[PDB]
Amino acid sequence: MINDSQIFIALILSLVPAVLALKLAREL
Amino acid sequence: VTKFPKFSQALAQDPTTRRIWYGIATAHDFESHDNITEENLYQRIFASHFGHLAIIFLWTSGNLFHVAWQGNFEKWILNPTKIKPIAHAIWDPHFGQAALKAFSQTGVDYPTNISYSGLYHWWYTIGIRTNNDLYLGALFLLVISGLFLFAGWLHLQPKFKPSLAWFKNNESRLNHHLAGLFGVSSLAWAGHLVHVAIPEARGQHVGWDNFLSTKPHPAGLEPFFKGQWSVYADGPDSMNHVFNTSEGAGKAILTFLGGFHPQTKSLWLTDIAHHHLAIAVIFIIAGHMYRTNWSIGHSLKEILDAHRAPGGRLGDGHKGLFETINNSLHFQLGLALASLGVITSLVAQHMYAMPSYVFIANDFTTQAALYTHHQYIAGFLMVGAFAHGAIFFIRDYNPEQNKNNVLARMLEHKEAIISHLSWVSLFLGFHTLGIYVHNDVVVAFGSPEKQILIEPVFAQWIQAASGKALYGFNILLSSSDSVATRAGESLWLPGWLKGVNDTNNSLFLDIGPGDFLVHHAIALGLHTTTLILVKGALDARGSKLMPDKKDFGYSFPCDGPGRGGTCDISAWDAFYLAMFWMLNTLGWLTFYWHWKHLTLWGGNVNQFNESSTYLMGWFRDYLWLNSSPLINGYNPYGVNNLSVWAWMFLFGHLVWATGFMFLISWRGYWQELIETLAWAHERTPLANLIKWKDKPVALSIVQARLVGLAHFAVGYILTYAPFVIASTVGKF
Amino acid sequence: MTASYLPSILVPIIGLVFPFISMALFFIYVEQEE
Amino acid sequence: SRALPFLEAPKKLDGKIPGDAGFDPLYISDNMNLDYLRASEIKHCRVAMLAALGYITQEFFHLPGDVFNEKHALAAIHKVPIEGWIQIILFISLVEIATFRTTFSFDREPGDFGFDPLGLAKSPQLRRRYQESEIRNGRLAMIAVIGFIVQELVTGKSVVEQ
Amino acid sequence: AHNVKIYDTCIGCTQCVRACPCDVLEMVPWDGCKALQIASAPRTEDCVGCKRCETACPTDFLSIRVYLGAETSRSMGLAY
Amino acid sequence: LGIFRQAMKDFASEYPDFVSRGLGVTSKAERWNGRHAMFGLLAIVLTGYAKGHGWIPNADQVLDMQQWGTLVMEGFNQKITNERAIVLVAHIHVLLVSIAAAIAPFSFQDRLLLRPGEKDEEPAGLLPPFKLGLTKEAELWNGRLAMLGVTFIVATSIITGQSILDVVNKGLGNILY
Amino acid sequence: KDTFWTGKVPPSTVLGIGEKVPSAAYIISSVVCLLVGSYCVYESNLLSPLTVTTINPLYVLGSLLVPYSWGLHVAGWIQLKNGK
Ligand code: CLA
Ligand code: CLA
Ligand code: CLA
Ligand code: CLA
Ligand SMILES: CC1=C(/C=C/C(C)=C/C=C/C(C)=C/C=C/C=C(C)/C=C/C=C(C)/C=C/C2=C(C)C[C@@H](O)CC2(C)C)C(C)(C)C[C@H](O)C1
Ligand SMILES: CC1=C(/C=C/C(C)=C/C=C/C(C)=C/C=C/C=C(C)/C=C/C=C(C)/C=C/C2=C(C)C[C@@H](O)CC2(C)C)C(C)(C)C[C@H](O)C1
Ligand SMILES: CC1=C(/C=C/C(C)=C/C=C/C(C)=C/C=C/C=C(C)/C=C/C=C(C)/C=C/C2=C(C)CCCC2(C)C)C(C)(C)CCC1
Ligand SMILES: CC1=C(/C=C/C(C)=C/C=C/C(C)=C/C=C/C=C(C)/C=C/C=C(C)/C=C/C2=C(C)CCCC2(C)C)C(C)(C)CCC1
Ligand code: SF4
Ligand code: SF4
């Protein structure tokens, strides 16, 4: 059911926690 | 000096490999770090908490995403008791073709792992029906993860760092956590159930697209504002309701039926909605107790200072405790862990007996996995609670400021406490082991009629009080004439009594002499684990052998071979010893749960009833008998889907046994061996071009105990998990 | 490009590249004298 | 305080800053970073005002083509091309990333990103009048647009029709 | 380095000094006891933390105490 | 420039070790990534042409697991095509050149990382100096433009749902195929 | 306020808003609350079983007077022994 488009949207969105995790990690 | 770890100059100056190990092992012990202030401590903890919440939400996101993408949720909901739910796809280039085939037997055309987490059952119950539902869920929780991550970062920025006073505002935090975090969350969940889960269960689609226009009940909120609340109970789902369809469906949104939906073998959704609404009210009321900004309400300090029994048996009572607790994060963490440990066990006990998720009572492997998972977690939490209790006594306890209060008086009679725990442990041990051995010898010589078999009549009486008719005790809910029976007869009792008196569920299992002996075994385990942990905490500050122990801290190797020898004298060592006992106790109770269910599900309760009263019965009929499917996961003739569990089973044995190396052989042996290796490296041509930066040394005395315990514990879990899973899959 | 390609691209990176970069970075970090 | 003339205002709210009517009965300002709260209020003001203007206009007037001919504002979302929305999102994104530093620096003044193209606030006294009125129109627009949206959800009619 | 402390219950018996394999300790004049001497720890940079000194000490509780601390090549007893 | 200059300083403060070796928000990385993007767009164009003109033999044929082993397998019991395997092999050639160039550079060539105490090149700004020929300027001009091109072409494909090759082919006016 | 106390009797200030209330007020109100509360419980649950259509809000509210009466009699004793 779930499209390639939907999987790419998820991967792109997963960059937001990735970047923020990097920021939190550094700040700690 | 080598910079890492930046938080400890003492470690940073160490020229050996110990620097790296100890750097890793003390990274989260913020209080111990160089130049820590009380304010910085609380701020760093708060940010770390945000990080942890994000990880939980990413984990949940991943579960949703993998099932949406690679699972068979849409196929599974059409035949939940027959189809196996898929966890995720396998991609492993080490696989041969025969293993690819063995793992590709779940309907779909690619290798997969079957899920035993019960997620499909949960998600189906709460109204999820499509992969798009799951996918949007996954997307949502990605965003929540990021939000918490951002809040973590934000609250470390100068103008957003909270003050120490904010962190010690106990009354406000309690008001908000009770009324908001618990109360409103519970109310919102009742909202979900009424608006979405219950309609979806009756075949009606309700989603973000139509939920504003779709009333949960035809009457709307008219009856609510007119106080005609009984309208919402009229017309429950019939006993012939087919879940996820309108056939036999009701209109009621709130009920008190009791017992189980006949088809799904799970608690009624309308009961669950009403449960959550009722506790939400209680929690919201409870969260108006404490005084914040408007003078009404209680001070926690004022309550504590006043609670002294006037007869003087509790001394000064709770005076001083407010300050003690408010200034100790270890006290608070110990309270949190203990309380959560109890609750996690309660979850394990209540979810097997009173399942809430549709068809989960039929998924035997999932039921077994979930019980074992939560009881092991609870075990760890309980040990941690006591570990932090000991740490509190060393680091945070001030005798002067606690003089003659209930906490100080515990220390005043610590020998009485410890010696009585010793007695009760010995008493249980000698007699429980003794009866089991009596039974083994007498059965071995061919006379099972000579066994000592005690009926658990007190537990049977408690079952009868809740309405179990089997025993003929004629007490309370099991008597027709009782005021207890009369009072509930028009509400939950019909539904409840049906479930209780049904023999084909786990709601109050039949119990006999086998159940008696293993309950005393469990009691032995609880008391002895507690003995070790309590002795740890109460002797943490000092003993006759080491009167100044508090000056050495929570964890230290020993105090040398003088005064007779002092190995394992620290409070940390009590934690280490208690872990073996916790694992033992959890072994006994999970073996019990699993065997009791294997024989129930298999329709041979007699096997359990007869074999469980002597220890060879457990060894033979439980361990040896049920190992067969597992150890044949692979063999000379080929592989099946249990191959992975077979391999993991052996992995668990290997890891466990490797632990024995660290636990039995101690440091000095290894340090001498490593010296000869340092010699060889420096004297070998070519090789001696290459030079270490960190001098190699054997692990520390405490490090060996910890590494040994880690291997022992990991091996314990990785042995039992495949057995409990493959045993059940293999049988059913 | 399709989604069924993703495991064959990603699993080698998460398993054979990400860990060894992480190990290398941690190794450099812990040996810095500063 | 002024807005609640029987209560006293919190300590932070002295009556100097623009938008100060001493209206904080919960005393949120005592715990919360006020500088950031002001920036957050001004941001919500500016978004709401554009949104309020947008709501009433795109009922009447329309961009060429059938896609942009939907009188109902909430119905227009699904009709408009996705690629159109991506460009608006990317635009808003770029603005927010550009402005991020200033927002968390607290050097400049809340809402101040040095945007006065035409040079309307030349005098400091005029700036003060404009700054108060920005918040006043913004606060009004914030209620109104929530009024508009809720009304559409309830009735199913564009602001003018209803 | 390890911390070594001598407390005022010392009876100046010299047994800790004699026990020490790294020459950390010595006897110095004192008025506080009949032996007219007390143990001293002037060279704790050479202390390996073996605790032979504490084993030797006759007083109850101990008059000499070793608190294990920051490790060095010396304290770890390395010949490499 | 004030926005960009500040952003560079912020990144340098956060990551001193990386920025000192020319990694991250640097002129070093800008240029190197420009070079790869320029080569990259040629490779995409050559791929579109090679596919169109039938240079790759048995393009749609799937590889055998017996010959090539388990790595031919994809996620959902799909096998890798010859075309995809071949394009991968083409990249492996230049990846190995890259590794050689990075670790064992020519004495004269531009190196990947900055030297122990080398400063970065001064940022070009919004528009670099327009110097025609084989110049650092012209390289930075074409590098920036290429990387913009890759960003656009990729972004276009996901938004519109067309293939990168289709977007590129239509962008050139159906010349490649 | 420090609420710590010694001996056999707490000092009235533990009663909070009710610290000035006389002993007789507490003692009489405690008896009334216990009897009314007991009656509500009886009428609701014991005189015929409780049904979905026979839940009286007053009896539910009235049942809270039973735990309340406990508090009232403790406060009454506290005031009695303090002289109030
Ligand atoms: C909310 C829960 C919670 C929190 C916030 C804390 C917080 C803390 N604990 Mg407590 N603790 C907890 C639960 C918690 N604990 C539980 C449940 C237990 C019982 C197990 C304990 C038992 C405990 C002890 C005995 C001690 C602490 C200590 C501490 C302090 C930090 C120690 C450290 O740096 O860790 C770093 C931890 C490690 C480096 C260990 C690595 C993780 C383990 C070994 C698992 C390894 C699993 C393995 C990788 C899996 C293999 C997979 C296989 C397939 C290959 C910190 C204040 C210590 C302290 O210093 O206080 C004075 C201390 O001595 N805790
Ligand atoms: C099978 C393994 C085993 C057994 C039987 C024991 C038994 C005991 N442990 Mg131990 N323990 C174990 C493993 C075991 N432990 C492991 C692996 C660890 C981790 C290091 C520990 C760590 C530990 C701690 C930290 C503590 C215990 C304590 C105890 C006592 C608990 C109370 C009790 O049951 O009394 C009943 C006694 C028994 C069951 C012992 C056996 C009795 C035998 C069968 C009698 C035989 C007599 C017969 C005539 C034969 C004579 C032989 C002949 C050669 C003379 C008990 C003596 C606790 C304790 O001492 O509490 C008071 C305690 O604090 N244990
Ligand atoms: C299963 C339990 C277990 C295991 C695996 C070990 C392993 C070892 N012991 Mg130990 N020992 C044990 C129990 C165990 N012991 C117990 C219970 C005691 C207490 C009596 C001891 C007491 C003891 C002493 C006193 C001595 C040993 C020594 C040894 C080493 C022997 C040399 C050797 O074989 O190297 C080869 C290693 C192995 C065969 C281990 C397994 C290797 C695996 C299968 C292959 C590698 C896998 C791969 C690389 C993993 C990569 C994964 C990763 C990238 C994620 C070896 C490391 C001796 C020693 O150090 O010799 C020099 C030594 O003097 N042991
Ligand atoms: C033998 C048991 C016992 C005894 C003799 C005492 C004695 C005392 N308590 Mg303690 N208490 C106890 C157990 C006990 N307590 C227990 C188990 C708890 C719960 C953990 C408490 C919680 C508690 C609190 C919070 C306070 C006391 C206080 C006191 C002192 C004053 C009592 C008073 O003011 O009554 C008069 C009380 C009333 C007239 C109120 C009636 C009781 C409540 C409201 C009934 C519950 C109703 C319902 C659930 C809530 C309303 C719902 C809805 C209408 C909104 C007195 C020394 C007070 C104190 O220490 O002063 C500093 C105080 O503030 N107690
Ligand atoms: C093609 C391909 C290949 C080539 C690959 C190649 C290297 C791909 C390169 C793509 C580039 C790098 C994209 C770069 C796009 C960069 C974006 C567009 C930057 C946005 C920055 C914003 C604008 C900053 C916001 C700022 C923020 C953060 C902070 C504030 O200070 C404000 C500002 C200051 C604005 C091969 C070689 C592998 C072969 C294959 O066969 C085909
Ligand atoms: C309206 C516009 C848009 C973008 C406009 C558009 C899409 C811009 C994109 C331009 C293009 C596609 C890249 C063109 C640059 C590619 C060139 C420069 C490649 C050179 C290759 C080298 C130099 C030769 C290779 C070599 C050859 C000789 C042969 C090989 O053997 C060796 C090497 C050494 C590799 C927006 C919407 C994003 C907004 C913006 O605001 C403005
Ligand atoms: C650009 C683009 C793209 C791309 C994509 C990609 C490439 C993706 C990737 C992705 C990824 C690659 C992702 C990742 C993620 C990750 C994460 C999300 C993580 C997280 C983490 C965390 C959360 C952590 C935390 C922590 C720790 C653990 C430690 C310390 C502390 C802390 C807390 C910080 C495409 C082509 C589509 C197109 C469009 C555009
Ligand atoms: C050392 C220490 C610590 C810790 C501790 C701990 C860890 C503890 C635990 C504990 C615990 C873990 C406990 C538990 C308990 C429980 C209980 C107490 C219960 C109860 C119950 C009941 C009361 C019941 C009732 C009922 C009902 C309701 C109904 C049915 C019937 C019955 C009867 C059952 C701390 C931190 C404090 C600090 C200091 C020191
Ligand atoms: S611990 Fe050992 S080396 Fe140190 S002073 Fe005592 S005897 Fe000497
Ligand atoms: S052994 Fe003890 S008593 Fe004797 S000299 Fe040393 S410290 Fe003093």
For residue B671, what is the enclosing H or E element?
Answer: helix B667-683
- Which contacts qualify for E32-36: CB closer than 8 Å, 24 or more apart? E32/E8, E35/E11, E36/E12
C32 contact partners, CB below 8 Å, separation of at least 6: B2, B3, B4
The residues in A 1-28 lying below 8 A from B, measured between CB atoms, are 1-2, 6-7, 9-10, 13-14, 16-17, 20-21, 23-25, 27-28
Neighbours of E2 (CB within 10 A): 22
- Best residue among E6, E20, E57, E62 to mutate for probing ligand 10's pocket (most ligand atoms within 8 Å of CB) is E57
Among positive and negative, which fits the CA dihedral B683, B686, B689, B690? negative
Atom of ligand 9 nearest to the CA of E52: 7
The size of chain G, in residues, is: 84
CA nearest neighbour of B188 among B125, B279, B94 = B279
- Which contacts qualify for D112-118: CB closer than 8 Å, 24 or more apart? none
Among positive and negative, which fits the CA dihedral B402, B403, B408, B414? positive
G28 contact partners, CB below 8 Å, separation of at least 6: none
B3 contact partners, CB below 8 Å, separation of at least 6: B12, C32, C33, C34
- Best residue among B49, B58, B147, B156 to mutate for probing ligand 7's pocket (most ligand atoms within 8 Å of CB) is B58
Q: B184 CB less than 6 Å from ligand 1?
A: no
Among positive and negative, which fits the CA dihedral B73, B78, B80, B84? negative
Distance from Cα B18 to the centre of ligand 1, integer Å = 19
Q: Do G46 and B483 touch (CB under 8 A)?
A: yes
The size of chain E, in residues, is: 80
The size of chain C, in residues, is: 34
CA nearest neighbour of D42 among D120, D117, D136 = D136
Pairing between strand B86-89 and B112-114? antiparallel
| Residue F87 tokens, joined | 């394009």
Q: A21 CB less than 6 Å from ligand 7?
A: yes
Q: Do E80 and B695 touch (CB under 8 A)?
A: yes
Q: Is the CB of residue B253 less than 8 Å from the CB of residue B494?
A: no
Q: From CA B594, how far away is CA B274, in angstroms rounded?
A: 32
Characterize B535-553 residue by residue with b for buried, 16 or more Cβ atoms within 10 angstroms of its Cβ, and e for exposed: bbbbbbbeeeebeebbebb
B547: phi then psi, degrees, rounded to nearest 5: -65, -15
Q: From CA C3, how far away is CA A4, in angstroms rounded?
A: 5
Taking the Cβ of residue B27 and every Cβ of chain C, the question of whether any pair is shorter than 8 Å is answered with no
**Between the CA of residue B652 and those of B34, B107, B590, B607, D20, what are the distances in Å?**
39, 30, 17, 28, 67
B495 contact partners, CB below 8 Å, separation of at least 6: B257, B258, B259, B260, B268
Q: Tokens 């030079």 appear where?
A: B691
Residues with CB under 6 A from ligand 2: B 422, 425-426, 429-430, 433, 524, 528, 531-532, 577, 580
Q: What DSSP line would sit under chain E, residue for residue?
A: --EEEE-TT-----HHHHH-TT---EEEE-SSSTTSEEEE-S-GGG-----HHHHH--SSS-SEEEE-----TTTTT---
Distance from Cα A11 to the centre of ligand 7, integer Å = 8
| Residue B454, min C-alpha distance to chain E (Å) | 52
Q: From CA B455, how far away is CA F170, in angstroms rounded?
A: 85
F39: phi then psi, degrees, rounded to nearest 5: -60, -40
Q: From CA F62, how far away is CA F78, in angstroms rounded?
A: 9
Q: From CA A11, how far away is CA F9, in angstroms rounded?
A: 30
Go through chain C and list every residue after which a break occurs, taking a C to next N gap over 2.5 angstroms, comma-separated: none
Q: From CA B335, how far away is CA B332, in angstroms rounded?
A: 5
Q: From CA B393, how far away is CA B411, in angstroms rounded?
A: 10
Give the three-class secondary structure for F37: helix
For residue D11, what is the enclosing H or E element?
Answer: none
Half-sphere exposure of F113 (CA within 13 A, CB side): 13
CA B426, B430, B435: angle at the middle one, nearest 5? 150
Q: Is the CB of residue A17 less than 8 Å from the CB of residue B142?
A: yes
Taking the Cβ of residue E65 and every Cβ of chain B, the question of whether any pair is shorter than 8 Å is answered with yes
Q: Is the CB of residue B331 less than 8 Å from the CB of residue B368?
A: no
Q: Is the CB of residue F150 less than 8 Å from the CB of residue F35?
A: no
Q: Do B110 and F77 touch (CB under 8 A)?
A: yes
Give the three-class secondary structure for B139: helix
For residue B114, what is the enclosing H or E element?
Answer: strand B112-114
**Between the CA of residue B723 and those of B106, B369, B622, F63, what are the distances in Å?**
21, 10, 11, 39
Q: What is the DSSP letter of G43?
A: I
Q: What DSSP line would sit under B187-255, residue for residue?
A: HHHHHHIIIIIHHHHTT----TTTTTT--SSTTTTHHHHTT-GGGGGSSPPPTT--TTSSTT----SS-
Which amino acid belongs to residue E35?
Answer: A
Neighbours of D94 (CB within 10 A): 10
Q: Is the CB of residue B85 less than 8 Å from the CB of residue B73?
A: yes
Structure-solving method: cryo-EM
Q: From CA D96, how far away is CA D90, in angstroms rounded?
A: 10
Q: Which ligand is in closest contact with the Cα of B539?
A: 8
To 10 degrees, the CA torsion angle through B519, B520, B522, B527? 140
Atom of ligand 10 nearest to the CA of E53: 1
Residue nearest to atom 26 of ligand 4 (CA): B303
Among positive and negative, which fits the CA dihedral B129, B130, B136, B139? positive
Q: Is the CB of residue E63 less than 8 Å from the CB of residue B551?
A: no
| Residue B642 tokens, joined | 């249990």
Distance from Cα B704 to the centre of ligand 3, integer Å = 15
- Which contacts qualify for B443-449: CB closer than 8 Å, 24 or more apart? B443/B613, B443/B614, B443/B616, B444/B616, B448/B610
Pairing between strand B634-635 and B638-639? antiparallel
| Residue F163, min C-alpha distance to chain C (Å) | 8
Give the three-class secondary structure for D15: coil
- Residues linked to residue E67 through DSSP beta bridges, in sequence order: E3
| Residue B728 tokens, joined | 């059940």
Q: What DSSP line would sit under B49-60, residue for residue?
A: HHHHHHHHHHHH
Are there at least 3 beta-carbon pairs closer than 8 Å between B and G?
yes
Q: What is the DSSP letter of B16?
A: B
B599 contact partners, CB below 8 Å, separation of at least 6: B605, B606, B607, B608
Q: Do C5 and F73 touch (CB under 8 A)?
A: no
Which amino acid belongs to residue B267?
Answer: L
Residues in C closer than 8 angstroms to B69, CB to CB, are 3
Q: From CA B201, how far away is CA B245, in angstroms rounded?
A: 7
Q: From CA B368, how far away is CA B601, in angstroms rounded?
A: 11
CA nearest neighbour of B13 among B25, B1, B4 = B1
CA A6, A9, A10: angle at the middle one, nearest 5? 90
Give the three-class secondary structure for B266: strand
CA nearest neighbour of F30 among F95, F157, F120 = F120
Pairing between strand E64-67 and E37-40? unpaired
Pairing between strand B260-261 and B266-267? antiparallel
Q: Do B697 and E78 touch (CB under 8 A)?
A: yes
Q: From CA F7, how far away is CA E53, in angstroms rounded?
A: 61
CA B167, B170, B171: angle at the middle one, nearest 5? 135
Q: From CA B447, how far away is CA B467, in angstroms rounded?
A: 36
Of C3, C8, C33, the CB nearest to B2: C33
